Swiss-Prot record:
This is Peroxisomal coenzyme A diphosphatase NUDT7. Belongs to the Nudix hydrolase family. PCD1 subfamily. Fatty acyl-coenzyme A (CoA) diphosphatase that hydrolyzes fatty acyl-CoA to yield acyl-4'-phosphopantetheine and adenosine 3',5'-bisphosphate. Cleaves CoA, CoA esters and oxidized CoA with similar efficiencies. Preferentially hydrolyzes medium-chain acyl-CoAs and bile acid-CoAs. Has no activity toward NDP-sugars, CDP-alcohols, (deoxy)nucleoside 5'-triphosphates, nucleoside 5'-di or monophosphates, diadenosine polyphosphates, NAD, NADH, NADP, NADPH or thymidine-5'-monophospho-p-nitrophenyl ester. It comes from Homo sapiens. Its main location: other. The gene is NUDT7. Expressed in liver, kidney, pancreas, pituitary, small intestine, spleen, heart and placenta. Weakly expressed in brain.
């Protein structure tokens, strides 16, 4: 099946806990996969304009590890719950992708999660201005604008709203699309 095939692909890129004990400032992100209308989508947040770090930018749910977290995957799930109301029973964490090094002292670990079909986002307005889906296949043929670094523009055909996706967020979206969608019969 589509979901079994995605999980099987994702598992081949799982690095697991290999890098998780290293003494960094630690953040986790959830790359949330949603199946709608026969296709896979990624769920993105738009950060509240109130936030000091990157107000109004598109990112994945996630945040800083805290002492309660049993592991890095727990960080991502805790933060996703706080930000968009995703409950742990509504997500299956399939794997841990390549961590992202930033600022010399920070390590961001991404987890891919399969999201339950009955989940409906409840944006927490103190943290999240908007939540939206992008079809995973979009990231294979994105609409690119050079700002000189590359920015994706995605227009939701439901309402005509355009979102800008860039940086680590855009890079991780492409990675997940390659992993899941490369080399498939039609
Ligand atoms: O803070 C995060 C996770 C993260 C961590 C490092 C980089 C990044 O782009 C994203 N995501 C968030 C925070 C508030 C509202 C929505 N989403």
């Amino acid at each position: 099946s589509m979901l079994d095939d995605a999980k099987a692909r994702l598992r081949k890129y799982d690095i697991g806990g290999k890098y998780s004990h290293l003494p960094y400032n630690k953040y986790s992100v959830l790359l949330p996969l949603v199946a709608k209308e026969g296709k896979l989508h990624l769920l993105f947040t738009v950060r509240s304009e109130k936030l000091r770090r990157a107000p109004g930018e598109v990112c994945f749910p996630g945040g800083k590890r805290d002492p309660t977290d049993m592991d890095d995957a727990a960080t991502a799930l805790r933060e996703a719950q706080e930000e968009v109301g995703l409950r742990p029973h509504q997500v299956e964490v399939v794997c841990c992708l390549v961590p992202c090094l930033i600022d010399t002292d920070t390590l961001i670990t991404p987890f891919v999660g399969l999201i339950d079909h009955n989940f409906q986002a409840q944006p927490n307005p103190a943290e999240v201005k908007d939540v939206f889906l992008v079809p995973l296949a979009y990231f294979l043929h994105p609409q690119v604008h050079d700002q000189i670094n590359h920015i994706f523009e995605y227009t939701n055909p439901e309402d005509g709203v355009t979102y800008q996706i860039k940086g680590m967020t855009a890079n991780l979206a492409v990675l997940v699309a390659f992993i899941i969608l490369e080399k498939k019969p039609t």
